[PDB]
Design a protein around this nucleic acid. Structure first.
Lengths: 82, 57
RNA sequence: GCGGUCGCCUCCUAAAAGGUAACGGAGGCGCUCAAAGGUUCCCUCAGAAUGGUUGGAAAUCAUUCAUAGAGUGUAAAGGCAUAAGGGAGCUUGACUGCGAGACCUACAAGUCGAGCAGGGUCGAAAGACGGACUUAGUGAUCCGGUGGUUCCGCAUGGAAGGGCCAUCGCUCAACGGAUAAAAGCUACCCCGGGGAUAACAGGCUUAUCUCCCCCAAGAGUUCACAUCGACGGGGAGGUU
RNA sequence: AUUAUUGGAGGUAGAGCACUGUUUGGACGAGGCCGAAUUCAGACAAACUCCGAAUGCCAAUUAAUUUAACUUGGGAGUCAGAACAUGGGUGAUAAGGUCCGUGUUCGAAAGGGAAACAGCCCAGACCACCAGCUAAGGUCCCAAAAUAUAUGUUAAGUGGAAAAGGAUGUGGCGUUGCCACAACUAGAGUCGAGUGACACUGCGCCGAAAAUGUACCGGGGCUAAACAUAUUACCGAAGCUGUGGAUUGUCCUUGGACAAUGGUAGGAGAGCGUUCUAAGGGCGUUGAAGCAUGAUCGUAAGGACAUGUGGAGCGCUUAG
RNA sequence: GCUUACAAGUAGUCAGAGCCCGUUAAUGGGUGAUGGCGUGCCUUUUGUAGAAUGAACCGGCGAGUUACGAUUUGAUGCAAGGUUAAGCAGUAAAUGUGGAGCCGUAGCGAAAGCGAGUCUGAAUAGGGCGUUUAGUAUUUGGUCGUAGACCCGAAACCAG
RNA sequence: UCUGGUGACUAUAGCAAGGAGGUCACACCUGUUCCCAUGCCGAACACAGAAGUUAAGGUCUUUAGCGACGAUGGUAGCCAACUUACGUUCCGCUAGAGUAGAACGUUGCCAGGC
């Protein structure tokens, strides 16, 4: 019944939909998106490139391949095979 | 090399996943049988939707 | 009702794809920078003690233990010794016209992109650059004002004026913005509705409330179990 | 769409102390009577990770089954949800509380069991029958089917409603040890036959007080008609089978089929009857329309035909 | 005519003696000693036997319509074409006559403009919308727009 | 086949001790006379030369004490499933981390004086 002492909270922001966008072993187009994330969780490998410090995209057609780089770091690649 | 499953239970009250598998085999209504060949992909289908049908021969 | 909030950014809840609520738990933004921007070189973190006017255990450069426990202009997470961290020269790409394809998504928006022409800075060069390590730092349309303004300018041509192209100013923070001109009281109140929603009684629940135990600390000079009853624990009742 | 073999993305349950923060102590340095930080063992974490499943998700251009799927247009309704079982937040590991996540049922679902009980268990009604086999739950009487068989457990009516505790309760699991222990006594000697702590138990006992009337086995009643197992037999639904018929959509390309037929808001299709008009052909004082009664005909809305009352109009076929 | 004074009842329905009947002639009709099963109807709801709303009973009356447009579907006529309006001589005959007009056969761009291509602009390059052409007149069904627009009902405002 | 040089592997590839050899080739070694240049001192950044040496590095061989990879047997957790009221328990699948016994002082790619 009594006007309460209110809440010093309540704020948040819209989610960005990060993660993988193309599956390993499937065929693509030149220029398609493969992953979206802050910082380089998965490095760009063969015939792929990093955009503006994110969006690892493909540069030529073919099939994608996820792989390990050194000991603890991964990478993505595309091969021309048809 | 030849099996014949038989629905001995109802498919009402279970999840949709099992409902699809039951129709995937060919079983329609209750107390129904279907003779098919024994394959590795058939044994795994009856293993998922178990305690509902009866395998023999 | 009073009070506090209303937009955008980061994390936890969120159950190893994405998405996911509450007046759930924590912090931030309404910028700043000619350099903290582009290019070519060059270098390297903490918590560690040495005994050095002086010492403020810490005012110094070393030296070695130094594994990122450091530093990033700004909160938080994800990243980085390619250093994305620390300096040095040169310069203005913080360029014009385009862009196959894809992510997100009710819609309006929003995000990334090989490469194609033109002109250039940097480097011997291969090459690299369409603003700051990444994600916040604004707000449609209408109207009004400015300049260049291969278009229509109406009986002909001039011609205020409209239109394409490029800028500028309010304030819409209740931040998808009712007309960018908006305070109260009804104990005389009136109509349309609702147990979708309060006051009385019923039902569920038992924090508090009233009992009953459990351990017994303490009170009786003896006798913790005559009696009182410290904290703590376990139940019952539905009469506050 | 599901399944079998394979590839990949990720950081939860659980673990762990290798970073961050927080702790308990034993030996550990840090004044002139008792300290910073550290060190060998360790402990805790929604905003701590050197680690890390099951399940789900995206691809597989891989076989076996199965029957959807996408694009454009016509027409919609919905924006108050609820309980049960799990995974969390919030509150008081309070609520038939409240907000999200994954399923099923109700909503829009009849039938059988839970004594009566939208959400719990079993199962999805096209219609006829005085046919048969089963599911959950059951078999002394009310009330369909065993007063069945074999083995144990239980003396409370436990079954047929709560806890910390308490104890010379106990059937099973191991001890421990006197060859004394029940009548000895220190606050020493015999005679004759079982004694106990402890440990895991399974079933009991006490803890247990409420207002109209026995008063939660549903009632009578039960020492098995209770509990834990085993095997059987039989009963039990509108589930399945047998026999005849109706509609579909298929199919084959004339009737055997193949399947299918709960339903609210809604979408689609085929029909019945009422008043008037047109054309053709009809009925009527030898009695029209209306009204009353009847044991008749069609899958439904409905349609004929006799008989009584009534005294002047009214049907049928095709179309509007 | 048949039935009823030991009985607990949404009044029915399934089975079933006895006592009377005799039809649209058929595995007929009326009455009901006993037995099993069973909490009306409409509205509004997560949920109603509800102690939530409405109706005493019976009869008569009482709620998606028409005019002009837009879009889509079926039907028919002609087909790169299709078709008329107001009129005028006529059974208020709705068949003749009437070619102002309307849609389609070619789009793209703010426009001037060019045209199977056009704008883009420094770009014929890459892209956007086009090109491969079936439509049209009347009528039938579905929905929508402007009118009161499915029907009934307010507190109140203004004029004389 | 030894060393020097390029390109694969999850530190099995290590830091912690040492052992022993040579300068064919990596090294310690001379200064600013020059190319470049430390806002700071040619130790890094450069030059001509090497009379002098093998410590160290460098390479093998030793230490499983120093740390990762860590095959089984279990077990927590979990997906179905039948029960009961769950902080459970039974029944089927997949079964971890940590703990051991271990492997453990890299397999090579392709060239140069041989």
């Amino acid at each position: 019944k009594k006007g309460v002492s209110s809440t010093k909270n309540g704020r948040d922001s819209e989610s960005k939909r990060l993660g993988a966008k193309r599956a390993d072993g499937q065929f693509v187009t030149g220029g398609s998106i493969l992953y979206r994330q802050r910082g380089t969780k998965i490095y760009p490998g063969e015939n792929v490139g990093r955009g503006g410090d994110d969006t690892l995209f493909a540069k030529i057609d073919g099939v994608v391949k996820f792989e390990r780089k050194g000991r603890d770091k991964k990478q993505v690649s595309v091969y021309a095979v048809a | 090399a030849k099996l014949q499953i038989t629905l001995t239970r109802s498919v009402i009250g279970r999840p949709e996943t099992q409902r699809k598998t039951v129709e995937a085999l060919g079983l329609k209504k209750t107390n129904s049988s279907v003779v098919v060949e024994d394959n590795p992909a058939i044994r795994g289908q009856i293993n998922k939707v178990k305690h509902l049908v009866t395998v023999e021969e």
